[PDB]
Symmetry: C3
């Protein structure tokens, strides 16, 4: 089976064997999470969300409607995603922009992923990066400082 | 009335009709929150805080003493504010620096707002931006990468 | 004694007099925390962790295995650390990279600290900075925008 911490609010039944969901996580009913994932403390996972097998999501990450994470992905702590390029309070788009993080990719701590982005298989996103364009498979991308 | 999630610690009675405060939020007694706000999971809202009507605060945001948010503002997930320009542990300033986010402005995901900042009406702050100077009304500002 | 909020999950007994640990914190058994610290809401503190006296850790910070914080350090909100330079899901290093934040240093809001980093005594890290190299004692470092 899977381990849901008593201090998490997990509303999805779609959770694979071996998955751990830690304290103060929120997981909404339609989320799909595969096997042997680690969803660390203080995460939010919305409804229109698919997460594969062997995925690590470190603390303080939110996975919004329209985001797909493939197998073997690493998401660093406080990584931020997004599904709305020109956000205005209470102006809901007809369709949320889709993001996909492809198999085995890794996103460094506190990176920011713009909406509509593909991060290719086995890519490596530097800690603190802002990703405004697709990252090609196996590419190491980081922002200039 | 307003919806306070049983898993939130909300100590303020100053909360407008239609406002939702989600899991694992902390709201201290003197906070003022207007009508039809959405305060998403994992937020912290301090005492000397005013938030207007129709404000969206996405997950993982802290609103410190000295911060005012006007009506119709969007604050993206993991946006960070601040009220102390030269922080040293246990060195408390006589007065906290004030920040104001003016009506209808939007702050992108994981942006960082320095203390003493005004963001003008209907401004748009790019995801991951560092805002070290006031942003003029209706201006789109983002950091070089 | 020390104050542990009923809404925190604190598993360490190694907590100094005067320390406050706030709502929705996780502190694992082997963590060492000194006297008169303030561990603000939504923090995660792992096992192989030493935190000195009079340390301020603002909301939404994770202190991983291999991180040491000396006395009188200020860590701003949503500051991110790290202990693994080339993270891949389920590829555990033999040894985690060590970070040390030296006495009286201050890290600004939403800064990102790469693994293996020393931040010298009384340094000041700008809000939103990415720290990829050691910061010398008493130096003010911030990223170009
Ligand atoms: C991106 C990364 C993999 C690159 O490592 P690397 O290829 O060995 O690169 P180097 O350390 O040799 O640094 C090369 C240059 O890029 C810079 N750089 C490296 N990482 C950077 C980053 N994340 N952001 C901005 N600049 C970065 C260095 O400052 C260096 O600059 P210089 O040539 O002017 O001296 C690594 O630095 C990184 O960010 N890893 C992610 C860590 C993480 O978030 N882990 C998960 C949590 S523990
Ligand atoms: C700032 C923003 C509104 C600009 O959108 P835009 O005006 O259509 O700009 P474009 O996409 O045409 O990009 C223009 C250039 O600026 C760069 N850029 C855009 N947004 C950036 C950002 N946030 N940070 C750094 N650079 C950015 C692009 O890389 C592009 O560079 P190039 O000309 O060298 O190719 C948008 O990118 C953004 O950041 N939106 C906020 C998303 C968000 O946080 N939503 C809330 C959570 S879903
Ligand atoms: C880094 C810091 C201490 C510098 O303050 P300062 O030395 O007075 O520097 P100034 O305000 O005079 O700014 C000098 C220049 O650096 C830039 N700058 C300042 N802080 C910056 C930062 N954090 N990131 C990027 N650029 C920064 C300014 O834009 C200015 O640019 P300009 O010369 O082109 O106009 C301060 O800006 C800071 O980041 N403080 C941390 C705040 C914080 O996180 N507190 C804890 C939470 S409240
Ligand atoms: C800073 C970082 O992300 N490093 C990673 C490291 O933490 C570890 O990540 P992973 O999540 O896979 O570690 P684990 O050993 O399987 O599980 C430990 C994590 O589980 C989460 N957890 C664990 C416990 C016991 C808890 O109570 N609450 C909680 O959230 C956070 C802990 O860091 O290994 C990666 C390769 C590394 O990149
Ligand atoms: C990534 C992002 O911020 N996108 C926004 C999007 O999430 C949505 O934001 P908003 O908060 O207004 O959405 P909503 O549909 O009113 O409410 C859903 C949010 O409520 C919060 N919530 C909701 C539930 C059900 C919960 O249990 N816990 C919780 O925190 C987080 C959910 O994303 O619309 C914006 C225009 C968009 O910019
Ligand atoms: C934005 C920022 O970090 N400013 C700092 C400011 O918040 C304050 O930080 P400190 O944590 O030391 O403040 P405090 O007055 O000792 O304690 C108040 C903090 O305690 C935490 N707390 C407090 C209460 C009452 C709570 O319920 N939950 C909770 O997490 C967050 C509050 O900001 O002083 C610094 C010099 C300043 O740099
Ligand atoms: Na952040």
């Amino acid at each position: 089976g899977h381990m849901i911490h008593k201090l998490a609010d997990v509303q999805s039944k779609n959770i694979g064997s071996g998955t751990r969901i830690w304290q103060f996580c929120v997981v909404l009913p339609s989320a799909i999470i595969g096997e042997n994932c680690n969803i660390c403390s203080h995460c939010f996972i919305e409804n229109d969300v698919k997460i594969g097998n062997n995925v690590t999501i470190k603390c303080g990450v939110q996975i919004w409607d329209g985001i797909e994470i493939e197998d073997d992905v690493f998401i660093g702590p406080n990584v931020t995603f997004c599904n709305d390029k020109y956000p205005r309070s209470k102006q809901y788009p007809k369709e949320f922009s889709k993001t996909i993080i492809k198999k085995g990719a890794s996103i460094g701590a506190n990176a920011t992923i713009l909406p509509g982005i593909t991060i290719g298989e086995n890519a490596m996103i530097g800690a603190g990066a802002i990703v405004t364009k697709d990252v090609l498979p196996h590419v190491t991308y980081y922002s200039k400082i």
